Amino acid sequence: RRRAYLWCKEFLPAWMLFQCVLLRLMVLESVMFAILAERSLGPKLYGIFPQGRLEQFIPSRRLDTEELSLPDISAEIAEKMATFHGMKMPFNKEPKWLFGTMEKYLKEVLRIKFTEESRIKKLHKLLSYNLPLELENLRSLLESTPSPVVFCHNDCQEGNILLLEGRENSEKQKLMLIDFEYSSYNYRGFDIGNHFCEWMYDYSYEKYPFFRANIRKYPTKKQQLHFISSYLPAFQNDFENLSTEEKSIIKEEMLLEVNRFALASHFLWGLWSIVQAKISSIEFGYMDYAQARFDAYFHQKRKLGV
Amino acid sequence: EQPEPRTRRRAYLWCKEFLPGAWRGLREDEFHISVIRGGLSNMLFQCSLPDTTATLGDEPRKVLLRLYGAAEAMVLESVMFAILAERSLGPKLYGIFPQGRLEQFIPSRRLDTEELSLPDISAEIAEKMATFHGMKMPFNKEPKWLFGTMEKYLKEVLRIKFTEESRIKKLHKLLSYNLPLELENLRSLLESTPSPVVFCHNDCQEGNILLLEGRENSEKQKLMLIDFEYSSYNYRGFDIGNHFCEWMYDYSYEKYPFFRANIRKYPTKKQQLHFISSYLPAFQNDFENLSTEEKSIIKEEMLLEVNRFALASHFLWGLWSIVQAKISSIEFGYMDYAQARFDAYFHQKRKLGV
Numbered sequence A: 001r002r003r004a005y006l007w008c009k010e011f012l013p014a015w016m017l018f019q020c021v022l023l024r025l026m027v028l029e030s031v032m033f034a035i036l037a038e039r040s041l042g043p044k045l046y047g048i049f050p051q052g053r054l055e056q057f058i059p060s061r062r063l064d065t066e067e068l069s070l071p072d073i074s075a076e077i078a079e080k081m082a083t084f085h086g087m088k089m090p091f092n093k094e095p096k097w098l099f100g101t102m103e104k105y106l107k108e109v110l111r112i113k114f115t116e117e118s119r120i121k122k123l124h125k126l127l128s129y130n131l132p133l134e135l136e137n138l139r140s141l142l143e144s145t146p147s148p149v150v151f152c153h154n155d156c157q158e159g160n161i162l163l164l165e166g167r168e169n170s171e172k173q174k175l176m177l178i179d180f181e182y183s184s185y186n187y188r189g190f191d192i193g194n195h196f197c198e199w200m201y202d203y204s205y206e207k208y209p210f211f212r213a214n215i216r217k218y219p220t221k222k223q224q225l226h227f228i229s230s231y232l233p234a235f236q237n238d239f240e241n242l243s244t245e246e247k248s249i250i251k252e253e254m255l256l257e258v259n260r261f262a263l264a265s266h267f268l269w270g271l272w273s274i275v276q277a278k279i280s281s282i283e284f285g286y287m288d289y290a291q292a293r294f295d296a297y298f299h300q301k302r303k304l305g306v
Numbered sequence B: 001e002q003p004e005p006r007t008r009r010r011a012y013l014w015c016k017e018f019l020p021g022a023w024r025g026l027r028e029d030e031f032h033i034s035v036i037r038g039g040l041s042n043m044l045f046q047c048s049l050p051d052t053t054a055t056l057g058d059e060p061r062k063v064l065l066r067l068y069g070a071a072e073a074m075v076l077e078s079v080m081f082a083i084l085a086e087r088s089l090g091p092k093l094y095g096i097f098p099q100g101r102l103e104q105f106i107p108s109r110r111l112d113t114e115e116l117s118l119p120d121i122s123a124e125i126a127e128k129m130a131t132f133h134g135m136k137m138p139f140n141k142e143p144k145w146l147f148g149t150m151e152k153y154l155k156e157v158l159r160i161k162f163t164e165e166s167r168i169k170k171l172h173k174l175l176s177y178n179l180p181l182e183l184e185n186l187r188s189l190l191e192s193t194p195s196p197v198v199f200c201h202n203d204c205q206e207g208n209i210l211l212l213e214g215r216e217n218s219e220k221q222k223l224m225l226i227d228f229e230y231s232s233y234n235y236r237g238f239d240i241g242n243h244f245c246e247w248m249y250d251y252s253y254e255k256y257p258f259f260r261a262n263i264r265k266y267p268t269k270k271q272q273l274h275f276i277s278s279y280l281p282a283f284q285n286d287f288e289n290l291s292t293e294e295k296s297i298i299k300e301e302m303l304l305e306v307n308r309f310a311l312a313s314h315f316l317w318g319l320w321s322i323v324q325a326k327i328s329s330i331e332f333g334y335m336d337y338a339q340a341r342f343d344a345y346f347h348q349k350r351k352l353g354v
């Protein structure tokens, strides 16, 4: 509390996450946030200091999982993502984040020792999949799958999408993407595929494991096409003026791209969750979530026949 | 001049990975780099595509690489640089990494000391400073930087032990002034001198002002302020006062102590009025509408404000220079410079007090 009061008094000019403006308790992240603020893509930045930062509080609510599939919501998310992907940022453009992070987590996963027997058993099951071998299978598949490198959000889930208070009747301008902690140059396919995976997961469930997974909620081809139909003219300048045939070809190839990279969403966040089970103090069914993601990984492989 | 091979390799890789377009596929053997400034710290290089290499988009053909060389300040400086870039006040920011930065290369030269007094130059500096001072920045708005910094440097100065006779002798002369007491006198003076708290550059010297290539025929739009390392919320008077002091110091002198000081080069009242007459309406659009009597009152008060705060320029940078004498291995007469600043401090005090 103490430290928080003085930040407001000194940084703000009548003058964890708290509403006082908003307070968050890092060079690249700070620079990024500052740039996005300047560009009016993200919340304004009021204060930057070691113990946190003072960010604009935007009247809003986060989306619910089920809202991701509303046509107008989906269309706008696609547009916002396309816009994000268009950002120049002073960061390394060589894609490293995706597979570097997977390796990082995998290294950690392979040396984790749990004490609780339930967790020990759950880990046994997961390790049975031969994760190092599987990662190489994934690397092979994705290396064969062209995807342009863009500035990705990397965590486009409903909790990171604000529905702006008073803009609810706006068809195309009622959302803002937030929470850029994972944002980096990455394969475009990951961002979109990750988003599509998020249709399935609801993190607001009030009973253990504190999420729901619904495999039946992955977007249908029609839904996927609706999304990318919005993304593509927003991202690709010349897209709108292509022939119908040209457009179909691009779309179809993009569906293959995004659905393959979705595999990386499951793999990365599955490994992540195992690590969190060990180190996190937050109450959440991390091992159960890991299992859900790996279940989805193999299911998607079966779907794609890969 | 060409950099050493290790630097060339590292520079290559930063350019290749951080810069878009043709840079991304550039081979090592195609990389062009020349030294702007060497040394152990804050080295500068120009990095360039082959002349025969076509750009793919809107990527730069040439950039500036800044290497820090030999954590709180890191975040603030980087964030500040990014913001100023976004606002078109400063060079574009192409890359940031632990070891340095890639910045827009701006065809230009820095001003010479003598040029600070040119009326059109001075007027544009005042305007640029006014603009600077209008910036909202996500930094602490309490004006703690000035006296915080002087206190900090004084602490260190009182701790210094030199082992070389000339430095030992010089330090003793400076110490003989009773710096802690003098600092309290200065504090008391400036305490009684109203000055608005604005985002200040804090180092508006000729070396930090670029004369933009092509625009040497422009009256009002031929400069850019750079080098924001010291920038902070501070008393407006310090920024202007400090700028005035800089008329007196030329850091381009080729022989020891590698600067020249000339007290007589301080702006005349006429010159000061010219500067502030440009600043004021730049800083407040409505200013031009006040009665001449109102304007004169504001100007007269501002002159005393800036001239008082000039004392803090002398004191702060004097102390700074003593600290550098101890911690820096750069070839500069830091002690001589410290003495120069204190000489000017007492001269200015006498001017104000007579």
Ligand SMILES: C[N+]1(C)CCO[C@@](O)(c2ccc(-c3ccc([C@@]4(O)C[N+](C)(C)CCO4)cc3)cc2)C1
Pocket (backbone or CB within 6 Å): A155, A157, A203, A204, A210, A269, A272, A282, A283, A284
């Ligand atoms: C996208 N990632 C980074 C990887 C995939 O998992 C996540 O999407 C994610 C998001 C939210 C959670 C989450 C954790 C804890 C809670 C909770 O509210 C549950 N409890 C109420 C039980 C205790 C307090 O924290 C809610 C959501 C967990 C994982 C985060």
Ligand SMILES: C[N+]1(C)CCO[C@@](O)(c2ccc(-c3ccc([C@@]4(O)C[N+](C)(C)CCO4)cc3)cc2)C1
Pocket (backbone or CB within 6 Å): B203, B205, B251, B252, B254, B258, B317, B320, B330, B331, B332
């Ligand atoms: C060419 N030599 C002889 C060797 C290489 O370094 C030099 O070029 C050189 C030139 C100028 C300086 C210099 C020293 C102090 C200042 C300063 O203005 C910096 N501050 C404004 C930060 C504090 C007051 O003194 C500016 C330039 C230092 C070294 C001098």
Ligand SMILES: Nc1ncnc2c1ncn2[C@@H]1O[C@H](COP(=O)(O)OP(=O)(O)O)[C@@H](O)[C@H]1O
Pocket (backbone or CB within 6 Å): A017, A022, A043, A055, A056, A057, A058, A059, A060, A061, A062, A159, A160, A178, A179, A180, A181
């Ligand atoms: N600028 C903001 N204005 C209003 N609410 C916000 C803002 N930023 C975040 N929130 C709310 O706080 C939640 C968590 O913040 P977020 O930036 O997503 O950090 P985390 O990484 O902890 O999820 C969001 O889901 C949203 O409910």
Ligand SMILES: Nc1ncnc2c1ncn2[C@@H]1O[C@H](COP(=O)(O)OP(=O)(O)O)[C@@H](O)[C@H]1O
Pocket (backbone or CB within 6 Å): B042, B044, B064, B091, B103, B104, B105, B106, B107, B108, B109, B110, B207, B208, B226, B227, B228, B229
């Ligand atoms: N963006 C730029 N484009 C071209 N030259 C520059 C640029 N930035 C700095 N310089 C040159 O390098 C010198 C030192 O740069 P500066 O940013 O002032 O660093 P320092 O803190 O070392 O003085 C300047 O006086 C100027 O001549």
Ligand SMILES: [Mg+2]
Pocket (backbone or CB within 6 Å): A159, A160, A179
């Ligand atoms: Mg979030």
Ligand SMILES: [Mg+2]
Pocket (backbone or CB within 6 Å): A155, A179, A180, A181
């Ligand atoms: Mg987050």
Ligand SMILES: [Mg+2]
Pocket (backbone or CB within 6 Å): B207, B208, B227
């Ligand atoms: Mg400089």
Ligand SMILES: [Mg+2]
Pocket (backbone or CB within 6 Å): B227, B229
């Ligand atoms: Mg500097």
